[PDB]
Subunit: 280 residues, 4 copies
């Protein structure tokens, strides 16, 4: 069924499935070993695949992710596509391995210990990944702590491109109903106006920052998603984490402006975060 | 946001959340204790709820399930709706507790041991639940071993009504695209013709039977979902499990006829299974 | 493909297609003559059918309409389902004939002349049809002047049930994205909150009233649908038509409350309109 | 709401709306006059716009079309985008005027008269337009005679890009359910397999050829869309038009192979049609 891509194809025998890194959304990821990089030696990788109960959406999401990672390209702050097994057999999406796990559980672990300097560096990396993504005209639509993995030496990598989109020529104005995006990370226009732009992603980034400065904290604590629909219209926003500068909290608050155009771009978030890092 | 239902409402203070029974699809279920049944004493129950990352689909699915369980009614072979916390707070769907877990893991466990007599009794119960469901004009759309729970004393109960539908006056002809149903359990008309009827559910039941007689076996072993789309058109079907009568295997094969009308009804499946049970 | 319904089936030879009443949404309607009513004589009817370029949505909409008209039942203020040709051949939905055409063009015609007494009577009939619809637990989702036909002797009949829904057991909370409803007639919760209730229909009724008291006027004159999304949030509403009582305009304004629960029910609209008719 | 595009924006005062060219799908088109081309003089154009009853889908389709025409670019066999009025007011999509109307009604008119030489030239132009479209990685999804307009001097132009898609980086594998495409022009994989490729467009082209050689004939005459779902699986295809060469009919039959890969590409259709034109 799946078409073929010569430049990304990888022989099934050079891969050795192993330990399951953890189940999830539309499938599961398992640690594997691959022979082929240009050294031609066995390197640890992560293989994303379907479960036995996969649905057509699961299939289309996994395929979509593989295709998105190809147009996005190479960058140090996003999980890179290494190869893929599509021909004669089960779809296998080969991406790079992240030994530390996802940012959420990672952060919640060290609360050795961790420092503020790290948090700002951590946020800066993510802002850099998102700026690249935006230059590539891609909207992630699902940026969150759980969707960011950390490798050895602690490199922050944005993952899970199953919901991402190509905005190069088409923006899907009044077409994206966004019913599959987690609500606590959604911008108001996404929730109510059937649109999604890079500006919608900055809102989510602000929520991601909050997650970082609360060390894996749960957004809108004590507030169920069900009542968040009215609160967001009333102008409700989250308050400052007791481990955040007043300048950092203003970035968050800026990412959360009702009007998209008034929110900062990823380029600005990079520049401003750059300064804040030097002075720490 | 959620409307109110006096007859099904249950006070939040009479419920005591506990151990998480296991994460999943569009939320999580946790063991809880409720005071109110008519004895007015603390009985163990299961509470279905949303996670922090819930989406609007997750929300609409959970609400849909609660509404479906209300029109379906009471029966001994389906998980019954006990109560629900909708007013002022997080949605809580209170259903009955199943101490043994789901049919799949249950079966895979005992392979004390188990007997053939049990398997036929197990299949008969499920056929009975499905016959009731059909009389209520409800199509489940997701019948599988993982979606059947077993209580103490071993009562088989069909669960997970998140994808079910009300076919009383509307059948959704050419409207149901069924992209969220697991493919290995889907009937051909469901996969290709944009329809779903009670007959589509019998196909799934046949796959459920196979799962039972293989003791939690994985349908279409060695065949990835991706290539199942062409095979199903070619007339491919699963073979007889080495623990199944020749008469039982014919029921399966009958549930898998390309033409829906040629498949048996749930009423027939009940009658025929009734006979087969007596003669064991 | 289409299933069979003995009680509604009608022989293809007893029907004689004729003049096309006018193309449209998902198909076309043509004047026809049928032999079979219980007199057994030739009576003029209207036959809804697909065009050569029909889509699967067109097909599913037309079938959905036929099924909705069956659960709704018989009433003097809605177009009634007379019969249907489903077996061996092109789907034919046989409904009652409306010699005067749709309410919009009808009204715009006489601006012999028409009187205010008529407008209130016209509005009262429609309010009555909608009250019945609501008791049957059906949400129309597309109430407008163009969707109301007038017969000989001037009986107002609500038509076009292609978008209607069965709310008996399921309400589709957070599932109805309503992207196919005309925006100038949509309630705010329908446009932004992924819900639709009987209260959403009263909003549309208010817009229908405005259309009547402006004699087929276009809602939100001088305002393109594209800018209506922001205006509706700002609290913008239409002003009083120069042919409407101050009491009538208050009904409209009541149907347009941001909060659904604060809007009048169809039962109240019937009672209040009843009084207003007597005193004219 | 709509974003801004400096290079495509056109002043509202330089445009003068006129005669309505004909209502339709998700809006209406009207003949207009524009001052600005680089001569800076009044030239006749066609303006696509929304009606009063537009839906969000109508809006998103019209916007999508404008965006597609921008990535597609300039070519002599497709209607070109001249300008657009998006800022402060009703969306206006300015495209080039086609004085003769659509290919279907055009053909059905002359049955002075027309010649076979014309039909082959007509088909060749369309094959050329489609080859360009495909090189631009765009899938039309709605190629038909009604969607092809003819200008003065008889230039064939492919129109209506409301359903088209950008396949540059994403192909939508198992995501396109295609419920809004007219069935008599759909390829089998489109109808049943949730995919759409350039090969799916060649199938539609074959149906377009049939329409040409039958002079605006209706595909699958005497066969309702409702029964076409089973017939297409049985291997049913249309027969040779009594005004078509045996070599031409083989092209049609080649475009209609069940297996996509076995169908000819648009490049081949251009080469082969090129030869056939010379020898006429």
């Amino acid at each position: 069924e799946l078409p073929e891509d010569p430049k990304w194809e990888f022989p099934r025998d050079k891969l050795t499935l192993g330990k399951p890194l953890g189940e999830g959304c539309f499938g599961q990821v398992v640690m594997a070993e691959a022979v082929g990089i240009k050294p031609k030696e066995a390197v640890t990788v992560a293989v994303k695949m379907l479960k036995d109960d996969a649905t057509e959406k699961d299939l289309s999401d996994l395929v979509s992710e593989m295709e998105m990672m190809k147009m996005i390209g190479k960058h140090k702050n996003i999980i890179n596509l290494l190869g893929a097994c599509t021909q004669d057999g089960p779809l296998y999406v080969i991406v790079e391995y992240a030994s530390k796990g996802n940012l959420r559980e990672y952060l919640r672990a060290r609360r050795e210990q961790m420092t503020f300097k790290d948090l700002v560096s951590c946020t800066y990396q993510l802002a850099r990944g998102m700026e690249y993504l935006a230059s590539q005209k891609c909207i992630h639509r699902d940026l969150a702590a759980r969707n960011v993995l950390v490798t050895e030496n602690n490199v922050m990598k944005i993952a899970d491109f199953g919901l991402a989109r190509d905005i190069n020529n088409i923006d899907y104005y009044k077409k994206t109903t966004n019913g599959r995006l987690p609500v606590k990370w959604m911008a108001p226009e996404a929730l109510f106006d059937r649109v999604y732009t890079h500006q919608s992603d900055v809102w989510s980034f602000g929520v991601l920052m909050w997650e970082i400065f609360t060390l894996g904290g749960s957004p809108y604590p004590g507030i169920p998603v069900e009542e968040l629909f009215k609160l967001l219209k009333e102008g409700h926003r989250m308050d400052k984490p007791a481990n955040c500068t007043n300048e950092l909290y203003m970035m968050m608050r800026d990412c959360w402006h009702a009007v998209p155009s008034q929110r900062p771009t990823f380029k600005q978030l990079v520049e401003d975060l750059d300064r804040i890092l030097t002075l720490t």
